[PDB]
Design a protein around this ligand. Structure first.
Ligand SMILES: Nc1ccn([C@@H]2O[C@H](COP(=O)(O)O)[C@@H](O)[C@H]2O)c(=O)n1
Ligand SMILES: Nc1ccn([C@@H]2O[C@H](COP(=O)(O)O)[C@@H](O)[C@H]2O)c(=O)n1
Lengths: 129, 129
């Protein structure tokens, strides 16, 4: 009955968009365990860009989110089949833009939706107006 | 056994300081219900200053916090004895600077600690440096 869901990301300056994504992932099935992977400072710098918050900060905030059952911090930058076996993960949940093609082929990918206009930085834009 | 705790505030741009306060309030006793009061846009404008986020936004974010059992939105600007009776509140939890003197006299005030340097706006200061 219980299904293990994995959602990875940077989760920098956690905002309502992230929280709604985690809620979505958590409620994909009736009984789930949501594991959240948080990306390292270095790989995030190397591949995405600057992070405002450190791994420790990004991880500590996530701990306070209702839908989060377990956190893997740091998590691998790229998901692998071996990683899924190690953590008994049934599905990977993430927005859908292919780096996830192999997960889709395996029937282990659950797409989630982004929430626009709600980021921490969009809120700063308000203040300046 | 179960104890009802009430924590009120603005909770604008929710950050780790708020989340740690709510965790503190929630863990004041072994078995609690944490009710969170969120202040109205008008009274917050009148008495504190501008709020970035609306009541609806401030409330929606709080919903995603693990420690929150119930939300009263909007909540009264000032706590009264009648309000405590209506919601069967045992203790009010808030930082300690006296507007809370009457609660302290009644044995219904539990002080919580602020967390410094961790606000959403302090994180914006980082980016600019
Ligand atoms: N506005 C946003 C921003 C991110 N998200 C989701 O939060 C998760 C982590 O995103 P980041 O790695 O960009 O922090 C991803 O699944 C992403 O789709 C969202 O659903 N809405
Ligand atoms: N840095 C901060 C900011 C607020 N808080 C707490 O969060 C609650 C709500 O604070 P505000 O009304 O300022 O949003 C209060 O109990 C306050 O003490 C905190 O513990 N640390």
């Amino acid at each position: 009955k219980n299904v293990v869901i994995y959602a990875d990301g940077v989760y920098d300056m956690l905002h309502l968009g992230h929280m709604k994504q985690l809620e979505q992932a958590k409620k994909l099935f009736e009984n789930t365990t949501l594991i959240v992977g948080v990306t390292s400072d270095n790989e995030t710098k190397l591949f995405k860009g600057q992070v405002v918050q450190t791994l420790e900060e990004r991880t500590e905030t996530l701990k306070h989110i209702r839908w989060v059952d377990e956190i893997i911090s740091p998590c691998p930058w790229v998901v692998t089949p071996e990683f899924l076996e190690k953590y008994k993960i049934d599905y990977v949940a993430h927005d859908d833009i292919d780096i996830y093609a192999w997960l889709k082929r395996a029937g282990k990918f659950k797409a989630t939706q982004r929430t626009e206009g709600v980021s921490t930085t969009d809120l700063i834009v308000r203040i300046l107006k």
